[PDB]
Amino acid sequence: DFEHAISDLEAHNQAKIGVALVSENGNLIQGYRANERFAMCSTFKLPLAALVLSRIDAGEENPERKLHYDSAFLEEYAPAAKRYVATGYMTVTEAIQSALQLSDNAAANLLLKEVGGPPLLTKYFRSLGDKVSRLDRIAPTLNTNTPGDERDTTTPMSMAQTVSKLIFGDTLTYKSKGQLRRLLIGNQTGDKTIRAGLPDSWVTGDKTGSCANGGRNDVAFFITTAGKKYVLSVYTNAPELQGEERALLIASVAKLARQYVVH
Ligand SMILES: [Br-]
Structure with a gap:
């Protein structure tokens, strides 16, 4: 079964692994x-970009506005x-793209300043139904x-559920949803993580995170050849592995999920 298999990976690797595969409806x-x-690390930039797109949706933000620094x-x-x-400056659009595709920390921090800081991202999570995720x-x-430490943390299910609502639910407008999806598909940092475990025929977008104390995380959405829609969150702490081995670890989780995903 699926849970014993992850437990086996935890053993071989002396690692803690959190994983959630969720459906289109969460x-x-x-x-x-x-x-x-688990620590969110840079996975928080995905919801942050979604909050900024939501502000754009509402007319409260302009994608071309100049963020001076x-x-x-x-x-x-x-x-x-x-x-x-x-x-x-960077425009709002350029900061979103850089924060998501490169994981630029300064781009992210410009976006946080514009949405009112970590507390307003935490409020956005609460407004989606996510009871756990918090930025501080x-x-x-x-x-x-x-x-x-509970600062800057989520759970695999919370994040996967949050991301399924953004990517597949009705939080964002069709335009924003499509932009977020295409930005995440062109992520430059995730080729060796979740995507590496999924078939290249499936559409996949993701946001990674690397933390201290062996922290390596990825959350992805994907669409199968049959048109079936999923989010996979993988959160790991593997302080004994070398960086490339931490990415292999995530990819291995994704292979198991691939297996389970069926007609
Ligand atoms: Br970060």
Whole structure:
């Protein structure tokens, strides 16, 4: 069965793994430690982009608005923000794309400043029905992945359910939904994680996260050849593996999920 298989992977790897596979309507199909708390890491940027798109939907935000910043706003990992900084801004669109596809921390932090900070992202989660996910810090200190710390955390089911509502439910307009989906499909950081375990005929979009204390996470949506729609969340702590082995670990979880996914 599915839960014993993940348990076996936990054993070989001396790792903690949380996984949730959820349907188009948010029902848990298979899970393992699906209700345990893990650090979100950069997976929070997916809901953050969704909040900004929701503000665009409501007319409260303009995709072309200039978000002004200077050198002091940059982060150690902020490859797009470093490129744009001499111009004095990134547009909302450029910040969304950079935060999602590159995981640019400064792009994310510009978006957080615009939505009213970690507390307003937490409120957005609550407004979707997610009872668990919470942001408290800005990037990157939210990556600390400390034991027993509940700041900046979700559960595999919460996040997968949240993402199924965004990607497949009615939270976003058709335009925003389609943009979020296409942005996530063009994610540049996830080729070795969940996608690597899924057949290349399936449409897949994802957002990864890498944290301290061996933290490596991915959440993906996919659409099968039959047209069946799913979200898979994989949250892992594997402080003994090397980075490439942490990505292999996630891909292996995804292979098991692939197996289970059927007509
Ligand atoms: Br992050």
